[PDB]
Amino acid sequence: GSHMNPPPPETSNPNKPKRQTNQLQYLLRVVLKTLWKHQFAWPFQQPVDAVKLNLPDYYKIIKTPMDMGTIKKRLENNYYWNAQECIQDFNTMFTNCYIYNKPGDDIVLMAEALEKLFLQKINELPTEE
Numbered sequence: 837g838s839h840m841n842p843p844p845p846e847t848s849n850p851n852k853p854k855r856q857t858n859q860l861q862y863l864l865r866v867v868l869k870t871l872w873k874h875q876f877a878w879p880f881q882q883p884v885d886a887v888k889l890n891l892p893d894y895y896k897i898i899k900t901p902m903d904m905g906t907i908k909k910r911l912e913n914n915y916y917w918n919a920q921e922c923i924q925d926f927n928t929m930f931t932n933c934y935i936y937n938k939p940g941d942d943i944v945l946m947a948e949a950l951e952k953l954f955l956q957k958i959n960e961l962p963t964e965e
């Protein structure tokens with residue numbers, strides 16, 4: 837896309853050790869699957885295109901971008917070593933939204949609905965085996 841958007845977060849790096857865990861499998865098959873199909877998922881299914889949205893300050897304010905398209909790639913391409921890394925990515929995505937946008941803006945209500953579902957699912961994250 838535009839040279840004015842940053843490169844997306846890393847999704848592939850052979851130097852980073854990878855592992856499948858039951859908790860990572862749950863994050864893909866339960867957590868990502870649940871949030872991805874939500875009515876309000878669409879603004880979070882890819883990196884924020886600050887050029888198209890006419891938000892030239894977006895990447896001035898948000899220095900740790902994350903989105904569910906990136907997370908889906910990271911889970912599908914086994915990028916992670918543990919569940920905490922992936923949970924951290926979800927939390928970063930929500931916090932980016934809450935930092936950039938006014939409370940009660942539509943995008944914030946959409947993030948909050950996805951976060952409520954996320955919390956319910958993560959409370960049920962299985963014991964690591």
Ligand SMILES: COc1ccc(Br)cc1OC
Pocket residue numbers: 879880884889932933936937943
């Ligand atoms: C937070 O800034 C945004 C503005 C517009 C859309 Br669509 C998505 C955004 O973030 C996920």
